[PDB]
Amino acid sequence: KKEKWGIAHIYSSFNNTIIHITDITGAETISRWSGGMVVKADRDEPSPYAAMLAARRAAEEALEKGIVGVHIRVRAPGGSKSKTPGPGAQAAIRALARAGLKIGRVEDVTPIPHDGTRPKGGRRGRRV
Amino acid sequence: DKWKLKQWYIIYAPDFFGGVEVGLTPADDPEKVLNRVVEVTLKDVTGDFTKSHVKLYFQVYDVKGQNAYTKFKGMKLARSYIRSLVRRKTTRIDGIFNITTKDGYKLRVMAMAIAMRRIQTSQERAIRKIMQEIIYKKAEELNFKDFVLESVNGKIAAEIAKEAKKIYPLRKAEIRKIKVLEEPQ
Amino acid sequence: DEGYPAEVIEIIGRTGTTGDVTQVKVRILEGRDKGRVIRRNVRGPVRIGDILILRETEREAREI
Amino acid sequence: YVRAGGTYALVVSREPDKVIVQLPSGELKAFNPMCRATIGVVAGGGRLEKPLVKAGKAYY
RNA sequence: CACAGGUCCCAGCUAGCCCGAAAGGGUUUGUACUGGGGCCGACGCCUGCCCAGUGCCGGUAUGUGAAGCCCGGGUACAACC
RNA sequence: GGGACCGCCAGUGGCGAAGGCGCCCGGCUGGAACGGGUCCGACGGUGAGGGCCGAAGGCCAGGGGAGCGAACCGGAUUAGAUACCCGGGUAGUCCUGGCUGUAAAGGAUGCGGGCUAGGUGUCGGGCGAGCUUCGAGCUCGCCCGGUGCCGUAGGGAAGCCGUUAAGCCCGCCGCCUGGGGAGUACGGCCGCAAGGCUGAAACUUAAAGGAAUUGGCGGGGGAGCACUACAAGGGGUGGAGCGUGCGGU
């Protein structure tokens, strides 16, 4: 068939967003970009704007490297942490769409525990 | 710049799955692509749109000059599909089974049954025993490749539903997961 | 890219800390996404049929 | 190595070039694969549970 | 003074510590529940703050830092700079 | 490679005297409901003393220690922060054998028996009827036993309870006699310790305490309104001399 398809792993949280493009197997990295080096203040890294910028940069790198199609994999921290993706997940996906990348299957691979470890914060939780 | 040093290899699916190309992988040496795992769907492997929720894992085992052939490793149903299948006011029966195929493959099979309404623990136990019996009989009757094909196809689940209708009607029956533990020797 | 014109075709309501921003729905008049209907925020007095020059047509405003 | 009463070592990994073993002190040491060892634990463990009590006991 | 008990430090073996000029040797027919080195000193309740000073340990980018080596001068060769 | 925990299904759901008890098969074992023209024949209820179990935490000894995290150490906020927030972290949380016997261990309601309108969900069993893909399947009604809600007579200060009584009766034990002092002092018993059980006086006080009503508040919620509120704007005051009115001398 001769089409180079990859996988875009999106790590979305309430503090930062990471976009990482890799080959079909996932063992070879193509482009890794996040909001930390795109924005300046720590409060704007998880912003959808920073998500769009980082996803766009990763898309340009992948296109120059010779990637046309990609399968999305959204991921929240999961485990004992939050189970909900951050604001910069759909923004990153649509930025990848805008940059000129074909999008195949879209899935959430957040690690869900089957009554695993104890979450942080104590029994009373955070009281701010 | 290290990227130019990389050259692409073509992934080939297992022969019993049609042996069709599934993707391209970049690597420097043929050794670095020996045990790479690629996740595909039965829809892409064969063509049927219905089985879009079934996922197959193919693991490389040999390289023949830009042609990396793979072998079956496991199968898992989609998380969204499982979530849709499971619902409140219904009973979910799960069966974990370690089985040996006729040829000698060691497999772990994870089967699921969804009932129309809440049922008693005794009924769930009876359904679990029925699933165990059918799975064991199929394991001792079939070989590895045809057993895996049967599991991916909705035939073993069909037999599970047909036999478990005696205890209680079933909303659905599935072989939700399969893992290849040890290869035969 | 010198902006893109979009025509206001429906008003949702007011919004903001002091109720200054009006949410509206706009159809893109020219560009790569010509004719697409999006929801965008607007500052100032706005009617139906007004033409707004949007720098980009990527993001969509959140619902009320 | 590991000859005192009540001591043992844990075989962690087996490689063609070295075998890793965790010793009583908590160190992971690499041994040649052909080194000989005996399975089990050394008898006589737990001595330090009982105090000596007497200066004469210490003397002997 | 010692003592049983407490606690700290070095050491995975050709180790740690020690005698000697060397060869060789003590701990060692030993192997961390062990060998060696300090302080307090049954038992009961407890042992708070301080690493700027001295000491010990780890790093040492950077400055200094002996001989040797290299370069230029000097010596028909060296000394010497 | 390791050590905890068994996600959704999960329910006013189910089992246990209570504390408590959720992955899956096999073995052992306790109790209860239902259906019995079955067996004994008052063998029953409650129980001062006494015995057994008993969350978390803590202790003794031996193991383990993944994640959390008292003490502690650092970073922040603050006038201060020995805290709330953030980064690490020992005991502990876990297993084996024992001690401790303490909880808002609360249905804040002790246990057995008889009686006093109904209605409506759900769990187990039994009976009858209708469907059924004949399923240990589905639907309806009735009896018994659990588990919720509304509710009539009646009860209560009221909140509310009302056949699961907090209603009228027949029994037994335990506990209370204004708020503090005070679960303190002394004495005794138990426990390795921490602690547990038992438990007063002098003196002081007019109230403490419960239910409910109206209002006033909340850095509670929801509707509204205001250029002596804001949002968008015009002009200013606050800085200088002076007019005038205050405070002070």
Coordinates of N, CA and C (backbone and C1' of nucleotides) in Angstrom, one line a residue, chain E residues 44-73:
Chain E
rG44 P 13.4 -1.7 80.3 O5' 12.6 -0.6 81.2 C5' 11.5 -1.0 82.0 C4' 10.8 0.3 82.6 C3' 10.7 1.4 81.6 O3' 9.5 1.3 80.8 C1' 11.6 2.2 83.7
rC45 P 9.5 2.0 79.3 O5' 9.4 3.6 79.7 C5' 8.3 4.1 80.4 C4' 8.4 5.6 80.5 C3' 8.9 6.4 79.2 O3' 7.9 6.6 78.3 C1' 10.2 7.1 81.1
rC46 P 8.2 6.9 76.8 O5' 8.9 8.3 76.8 C5' 9.9 8.7 75.9 C4' 10.8 9.8 76.4 C3' 11.8 10.3 75.5 O3' 11.3 11.2 74.6 C1' 12.8 9.8 77.6
rU47 P 12.1 11.6 73.2 O5' 13.6 12.0 73.7 C5' 14.0 13.4 73.6 C4' 15.5 13.5 73.8 C3' 16.3 13.2 72.7 O3' 16.5 14.3 71.8 C1' 17.2 12.1 74.6
rG48 P 16.0 14.2 70.3 O5' 15.3 15.7 70.1 C5' 14.1 16.0 70.6 C4' 14.0 17.5 70.9 C3' 14.8 18.4 70.0 O3' 14.2 18.7 68.8 C1' 15.0 19.1 72.3
rC49 P 15.1 18.8 67.4 O5' 15.7 20.2 67.5 C5' 14.9 21.4 67.4 C4' 15.8 22.6 67.4 C3' 17.0 22.6 66.5 O3' 16.7 23.0 65.2 C1' 17.7 23.3 68.7
rC50 P 17.5 22.3 63.9 O5' 18.9 23.1 64.0 C5' 19.0 24.5 64.0 C4' 20.3 25.0 64.3 C3' 21.5 24.4 63.5 O3' 21.6 25.0 62.3 C1' 22.0 24.4 65.8
rC51 P 21.7 24.1 60.9 O5' 23.3 23.6 61.0 C5' 24.3 24.6 61.2 C4' 25.5 24.2 60.4 C3' 25.3 24.0 58.9 O3' 26.4 24.5 58.1 C1' 26.3 22.1 59.8
rA52 P 26.3 25.9 57.4 O5' 27.4 26.8 58.1 C5' 27.9 28.0 57.5 C4' 28.7 28.9 58.4 C3' 29.9 28.3 59.0 O3' 31.0 28.4 58.1 C1' 28.7 29.2 60.7
rG53 P 32.2 27.3 58.2 O5' 32.7 27.3 59.7 C5' 33.4 28.4 60.2 C4' 34.2 28.1 61.5 C3' 35.0 26.8 61.5 O3' 36.2 27.0 60.9 C1' 33.7 27.0 63.5
rU54 P 36.8 25.9 59.8 O5' 37.3 24.7 60.6 C5' 38.4 24.8 61.5 C4' 38.5 23.6 62.4 C3' 38.5 22.2 61.7 O3' 39.8 21.9 61.1 C1' 37.1 22.1 63.5
rG55 P 39.9 21.2 59.7 O5' 39.3 19.7 60.0 C5' 40.0 18.8 60.8 C4' 39.1 17.6 61.3 C3' 38.6 16.7 60.2 O3' 39.6 15.8 59.7 C1' 36.8 17.2 61.7
rC56 P 39.7 15.4 58.2 O5' 38.5 14.4 57.9 C5' 38.5 13.2 58.5 C4' 37.1 12.5 58.4 C3' 36.7 12.3 56.9 O3' 37.2 11.2 56.3 C1' 34.9 13.2 58.2
rC57 P 37.5 11.3 54.7 O5' 36.1 11.1 54.0 C5' 35.3 10.0 54.2 C4' 33.9 10.1 53.7 C3' 33.8 10.6 52.2 O3' 34.0 9.5 51.3 C1' 32.4 11.9 53.5
rG58 P 34.8 9.8 49.9 O5' 33.7 10.5 49.0 C5' 32.6 9.7 48.5 C4' 31.6 10.6 47.9 C3' 32.1 11.5 46.7 O3' 32.2 10.8 45.5 C1' 30.7 12.8 48.2
rG59 P 33.2 11.3 44.4 O5' 32.6 12.7 43.9 C5' 31.4 12.7 43.1 C4' 31.0 14.1 42.8 C3' 32.0 15.0 41.9 O3' 31.8 14.7 40.5 C1' 31.2 16.2 43.8
rU60 P 33.1 14.8 39.6 O5' 33.7 16.3 39.8 C5' 32.9 17.4 39.4 C4' 33.5 18.7 40.0 C3' 34.9 19.1 39.5 O3' 34.9 19.8 38.3 C1' 34.8 19.2 41.9
rA61 P 35.5 19.1 36.9 O5' 35.1 20.3 35.8 C5' 34.0 20.2 35.0 C4' 33.3 21.5 35.0 C3' 34.1 22.8 35.0 O3' 34.7 23.1 33.8 C1' 32.3 23.0 36.5
rU62 P 36.3 23.4 33.7 O5' 36.5 24.6 34.7 C5' 36.1 25.9 34.3 C4' 36.3 26.9 35.4 C3' 37.8 27.1 35.9 O3' 38.6 27.9 35.1 C1' 36.3 26.9 37.7
rG63 P 40.1 27.7 34.9 O5' 40.7 28.3 36.3 C5' 40.8 29.7 36.5 C4' 41.5 30.0 37.9 C3' 42.8 29.4 38.1 O3' 43.9 30.2 37.6 C1' 41.4 29.0 40.0
rU64 P 45.2 29.4 37.0 O5' 46.0 29.0 38.3 C5' 46.5 29.9 39.2 C4' 46.9 29.3 40.5 C3' 48.0 28.1 40.4 O3' 49.3 28.6 40.4 C1' 46.1 27.4 41.7
rG65 P 50.4 28.0 39.4 O5' 50.6 26.5 40.1 C5' 51.1 26.3 41.4 C4' 50.9 24.9 41.9 C3' 51.4 23.8 41.0 O3' 52.7 23.6 41.1 C1' 49.1 23.4 41.6
rA66 P 53.8 24.0 40.0 O5' 54.9 22.9 40.0 C5' 55.9 22.9 41.1 C4' 56.4 21.5 41.3 C3' 57.0 20.9 40.1 O3' 58.4 21.3 39.9 C1' 55.6 19.3 41.2
rA67 P 58.9 21.5 38.4 O5' 59.2 20.0 37.9 C5' 60.2 19.3 38.5 C4' 60.0 17.8 38.3 C3' 60.0 17.3 36.9 O3' 61.4 17.0 36.4 C1' 58.1 16.4 37.9
rG68 P 61.8 17.5 34.9 O5' 61.0 16.5 34.0 C5' 61.2 15.1 34.0 C4' 60.1 14.3 33.4 C3' 59.8 14.7 31.9 O3' 60.7 14.0 31.0 C1' 57.8 14.6 33.1
rC69 P 61.3 14.8 29.8 O5' 60.1 15.1 28.8 C5' 59.5 14.0 28.2 C4' 58.2 14.4 27.5 C3' 58.2 15.5 26.5 O3' 58.6 15.0 25.2 C1' 56.5 15.9 28.0
rC70 P 59.5 16.0 24.3 O5' 58.5 17.1 23.8 C5' 57.4 16.8 22.9 C4' 56.6 18.0 22.7 C3' 57.3 19.2 22.2 O3' 57.5 19.2 20.8 C1' 55.8 19.8 23.9
rC71 P 58.7 20.1 20.2 O5' 58.2 21.6 20.3 C5' 57.1 22.0 19.5 C4' 56.8 23.5 19.9 C3' 57.9 24.5 19.8 O3' 58.2 24.9 18.4 C1' 56.7 24.8 21.8
rG72 P 59.7 25.2 18.0 O5' 60.0 26.7 18.6 C5' 59.4 27.8 18.1 C4' 59.6 29.1 18.9 C3' 61.1 29.4 19.2 O3' 61.7 30.1 18.1 C1' 59.8 29.6 21.2
rG73 P 63.3 30.0 17.9 O5' 63.9 30.8 19.2 C5' 63.8 32.2 19.2 C4' 64.3 32.7 20.6 C3' 65.7 32.6 20.9 O3' 66.5 33.6 20.3 C1' 64.4 32.0 22.8

